[PDB]
């Protein structure tokens, strides 16, 4: 018919789906260094996914890993282990003015 007519196909400019910083990585309850990055330094409170930026699947794994590690004797409950205070800050929260 006509060569200049549009053609049906999938969006070629579509950007790849974004991934969480833990996408494709295993979350173990023994890796307290990783888990400590998602708790409050002062209170040990688990950060919500709006702070951690994790997807639902990894927010659950991190939560379940923290709860397991805490009661099995690997992780403190009421504060972040001070050994891990100088690790990379991956969460979007600032407590100082």
């Amino acid at each position: 018919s006509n060569e200049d007519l549009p053609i049906s196909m999938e969006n070629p400019y579509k950007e790849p789906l974004k991934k969480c910083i833990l996408c494709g990585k295993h979350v173990d309850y023994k890796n307290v260094q990783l888990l400590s990055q998602f708790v409050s330094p002062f209170t040990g409170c688990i950060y919500g996914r709006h702070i951690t930026g994790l997807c639902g699947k990894k927010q659950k794994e991190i939560t379940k890993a923290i709860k397991r590690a805490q009661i099995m004797g690997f992780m403190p409950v009421t504060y972040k282990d001070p050994a891990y205070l100088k690790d990379p800050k991956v969460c979007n929260i600032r407590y100082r003015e």
Partner: peptide, 15 residues
């Protein structure tokens, strides 16, 4: 050692 950390770029930082 099972400890390692993640960065804002998704990179592992071994101890």
């Amino acid at each position: 050692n099972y400890n390692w950390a993640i960065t804002r770029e998704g990179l592992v930082v071994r101890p």
